[PDB]
Ligand binder design. Structure first.
Ligand SMILES: O=c1[nH]cnc2c(C[N@@H+]3C[C@H](CO)[C@@H](O)C3)c[nH]c12
Ligand SMILES: O=c1[nH]cnc2c(C[N@@H+]3C[C@H](CO)[C@@H](O)C3)c[nH]c12
Ligand SMILES: O=c1[nH]cnc2c(C[N@@H+]3C[C@H](CO)[C@@H](O)C3)c[nH]c12
Ligand SMILES: O=c1[nH]cnc2c(C[N@@H+]3C[C@H](CO)[C@@H](O)C3)c[nH]c12
Ligand SMILES: O=c1[nH]cnc2c(C[N@@H+]3C[C@H](CO)[C@@H](O)C3)c[nH]c12
Ligand SMILES: O=c1[nH]cnc2c(C[N@@H+]3C[C@H](CO)[C@@H](O)C3)c[nH]c12
Lengths: 237, 237, 238, 238, 238, 236
């Protein structure tokens, strides 16, 4: 394809995907052994290595539902990928969610039309795989990292013309605003694979508190430990 | 209210709700001790008793999203109910789902407009509470009952003018078609409570197999054992 | 053979009155009809057949909301040969000039349900009653000396609506009562080639909170039933 | 004055018949009314006032389509005090049992326009006629010996539709005629607190392709006009 | 042979100027063309053909609103061989920097109609003009010394809108004028493989309340006509 | 969070491909005195001169949600007046061929973004007229045949509704890409100007495809046209 210049075999059966290809590089270099770069078309870096002896890939998916939908579809159909774990950032709308909290999207709401296009303009509930979600919760408990599990909201406009929607999201308990989960979940169902999104809170939409671009690139490590350990728990169940 | 003729305290903090009030009567009489009838307005029978010493209520919610939304809302706001477990029936679209299989709706798709009305016409992912879902999966393992966990589809028209939509549901891995879960999940989120739907497959939309009215009323009991045992798991943290 | 109705063909009259509440159906049958038999009780959704002034009449609950009544209406028509359904409901008022216990006739029913969009290529289906059944009801009310208003109902999906401002829009557009069923019954009647009408008694005022008791709703809205039954006789004789 | 009507208050009767075609309005005024004066001609949209059997009546074109007729109907109601509008239209049939020159009465009007969604918070507004006006029309037809059907019209935005399959849906749902205006007139009437009814003569059959000529539509659809005018007299007399 | 146009193939030029108002079409033809003949008068929708500087040109009313103009535009294209339509309309301004009598050129047209959703599987169809026709109009305006703005129109279905707040949105997004047709004409031109452009003169200012008279709209918006006619000659000579 | 540059680092005109490596190629190949001004998330951006005139080029990533972020921030935070997207697209018409250049006077879409801006009505996502004319005139001067008309900005490359391509073809859509309608909505929202010019990299019907290297470094016509169009705009 125009998007992935790898050969079949180059990816593991599980791929962790941040939006930022530079965070994918940092993740692979910091957590994995015997790392090879396996993709670089359009600068969208992907890598394969081992974590505690288990093959794991890590590859950026870019920002937004249309970008990540391409990469996730191709990994599943063209490279045999079974599980995708998005390891993202997100913005908090709830006053009881703080910067650097880790949130797990058992569901993802969205203002995109992509799932309506798949589902005859009805409401498709964009959900994670249950066992992957359980694995992540159990991994977080073993690492002593607090998590909340619930709904994300995958937005199409970061610079939204309707900020009042944040109040609606908050009323409905949305844990974090990001731009991808509902898309990845729709692709996973469409093409018969499994996915989960875990995010670290990088911005507070109410308070204005934020992290730097450097922090987002190299500093959200709890979520990656949880993600990797969750894979091992899923293998051994 | 016009729908419930009970006093606060008459209901437990957890209520199991089938659509059929006669199934509610059967559940209470068969599984609970010291049962009392606490509601009978419009014939929508509700009961309260104990299960292994633990206070539990069971009450009908009627058919369809508009019916069950009324009862779920009132139990939460007027009677202090913290958890609702819908114990329903459903129609299968998948070739690997059989009559009497028990399915757990971690999400519920829908063709209703009710969540759009709540959510500014965007896609609200109607999801169960994660811990209640985990409790149900764990209770099923302990009871030796096979389950599948994933998406239900809550339909507004049992007699649908669009049977092709079943093919779409199948392609997206929908485990069962019922008429309520998405509405119950929307209410639970709106009013700050927790819910889960567990259903027994009563019809197969592809094979044409159907159970009788009597079977639906009194024979789908694995789901009830799972529901009740899941409550006890939830209490024990 | 259906999961919803445990009757045999023949058990229902060609005209069925339908309240949402099966206990109201029981009260209607026992109060207004002779030689009554119970003909359905699956899911507690009581139905009955008797005679009114010698004419066969059935009365059966349809439950709350469009998805509930759609199932029962469809089955009565296709499986039991029912020609006419008259919903005999309650409703909540939004207009200042509509009062508790007024009787309102839904020539049309607006809705916030998606069911008619599903039937009609996502366009606007005008959910309307049968014209002659509507005329029969107006004439029967006139003959009884009971005032009625004839116009639009609004069939809501959420009794506990997250958008109460919509009641203002309903009032501005002259909606006579809010209930939860008419637009669904009208869509089923058109889909399956039968006739329907919804008549409702105002049981609540949505602006003021004025309310009737559960017992009042179940046994006490009699004018609408006399109007419904007499309207059937007018229709037979026309 | 508005850009659309160059008449003075008082120039219109409290009842206005409205065909889409200003030349049919001219025909109606010349053929059925006495003491006629022309009261509007802006944009060629001819309107007239005279008397029928002594009763003041106006007749004015509304143009083709919902956006055109919405402008005229609103202004007549709010600026000229009009109480009742009877659209006297043509329509295209989709049913086999509906034939050229049949008269149909639109107790409701479905639509593929977005205008009533704009008025009604994107829900389904059931665009309905006034009940008494409808009854008056049905009764007048009976007195004139003209067979009518009473039911749903479908008010299309696109005469040359990109979705002819929709006609099959219309036919299933018993749609009596396809025109382009009623649902818009009924929305305006409700919005601004007046009463309206649409009566149409079948001028095309969508299935057989048979079409009446322009001249036949302009000056030959007498039954619907006789029905409309007599229906007004019925409405006056309770 | 259509119900809407009583003309023969060849009666129309390959280019037709279309205002909404048939009386403006008459004024345009009589004022600007030589050897004029009337070629349509069905429904009072006057159409004419003559020459401009020796070049055959037609001018015909399209009526108010998308459904009206969609019928005439389609038939001109498919039945009379028309290749270009230039709508020469009026519009209402929402911007503070747009004044009465300004000429605006609609390289695009937004809309609240459902017609393009019906053509385009309920997605967003960008209703655009033909580029070269747009260029020709800009260049003709420069040659005629007439200031123009080129950008988006908004084609409304409800002149009497229940949502005046939308004007604030239009203004934010730079909408140059509110009219009722352009999006519909552009949708038909794309559907049937022809070319269109809408040029409008500001007749009302929605914020200041300034309004031109019916007479002004009919006969005084002539800069846009000079631009339209000269733009055709440029298009021929490219 | 997305751009690590100071005010003044971008020219008033920015060319934007989706591919940051194509941005690098454009800067290296067509501009002088180039410096890299952004690299956050790998989304490379550069500023240099074309025939003496200051010009920037920066990737926008794939899809409406990605490019809407970059375009917004360039306008509001970096004072950018004109954005010219220099993209690829897939053809659906039989008379549109690989390597053909197409100019999006308008962009249709299946995204909800403009509905969210425009009270759920139809916003006609259009280019700036003069930028469009400049590009057409520049193409004529370069002797490059262009078609000018509607693009279609898709949200799903791997669409579940391939029948829609038939509808696009009927309606004359020149190319399918994933960005224009979003960039045009942002430009209107924040009061700037934009145009999309694309090279056909795929034929959606025939299956003809250019390689990834071809997309990255061989679509020169559209770049020459974009840069020359800027000079025409300066001088008109
Ligand atoms: O405030 C926000 N709104 C929407 N998404 C995010 C995210 C998550 N990301 C990061 C990135 C946009 O900065 C896109 O991939 C989605 C962090 N903060 C926010
Ligand atoms: O085939 C089906 N379609 C939709 N729902 C159900 C259900 C679940 N219920 C049972 C009941 C309708 O029979 C309503 O409460 C939803 C079982 N089978 C089906
Ligand atoms: O305030 C109201 N909102 C909606 N419906 C009703 C009705 C009519 N019914 C009664 C019942 C809900 O109480 C449902 O079947 C529709 C009475 N009051 C109201
Ligand atoms: O075949 C049809 N389709 C839609 N409308 C009409 C009508 C009614 N009119 C007549 C006119 C278009 O001819 C417009 O005002 C609506 C007659 N025939 C048809
Ligand atoms: O304020 C306005 N709103 C909508 N359209 C127009 C127009 C343009 N026309 C004129 C005519 C309505 O007066 C219809 O054909 C559209 C001028 N002013 C306005
Ligand atoms: O076949 C296609 N469908 C949708 N977009 C494109 C494009 C244009 N791009 C390239 C890139 C996806 O390959 C995204 O930025 C939009 C080229 N070919 C196609």
């Amino acid at each position: 394809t125009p998007h992935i210049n790898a050969e079949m075999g180059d990816f593991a059966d599980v791929v962790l995907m941040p939006g930022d290809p530079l965070r994918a590089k940092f993740i692979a270099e910091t957590f994995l052994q015997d790392v090879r770069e396996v993709n670089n078309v359009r600068g969208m870096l992907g890598f394969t290595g081992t974590y505690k002896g288990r093959k794991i890939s890590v590859m950026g998916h870019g920002m937004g539902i249309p970008s990540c939908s391409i990469y996730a579809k191709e990994l599943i159909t063209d490279f045999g990928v079974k599980k995708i774990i998005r390891v993202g950032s997100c913005g908090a709308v709830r006053t009881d969610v703080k910067l650097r909290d880790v949130v797990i999207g058992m569901g993802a709401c969205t203002d995109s039309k992509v799932n309506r296009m798949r589902f005859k303009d009805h409401d498709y509930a964009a959900i994670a795989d249950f066992e992957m979600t359980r694995n992540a919760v159990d991994a977080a408990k073993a690492k002593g990292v607090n998590v909340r599990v619930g709904n994300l909201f995958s937005a199409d406009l970061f610079y939204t013309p309707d900020p009042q929607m944040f109040d609606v999201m908050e009323k409905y308990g949305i844990l974090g605003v990001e731009m991808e989960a509902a898309g990845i979940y729709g692709v996973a169902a469409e093409f018969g694979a499994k996915a989960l999104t875990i995010c670290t809170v990088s911005d507070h939409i109410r308070t204005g508190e934020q992290t730097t671009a450097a922090e987002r690139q190299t500093t959200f490590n709890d979520m990656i430990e949880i993600a990797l350990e969750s894979v091992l728990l899923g293998d051994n169940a």
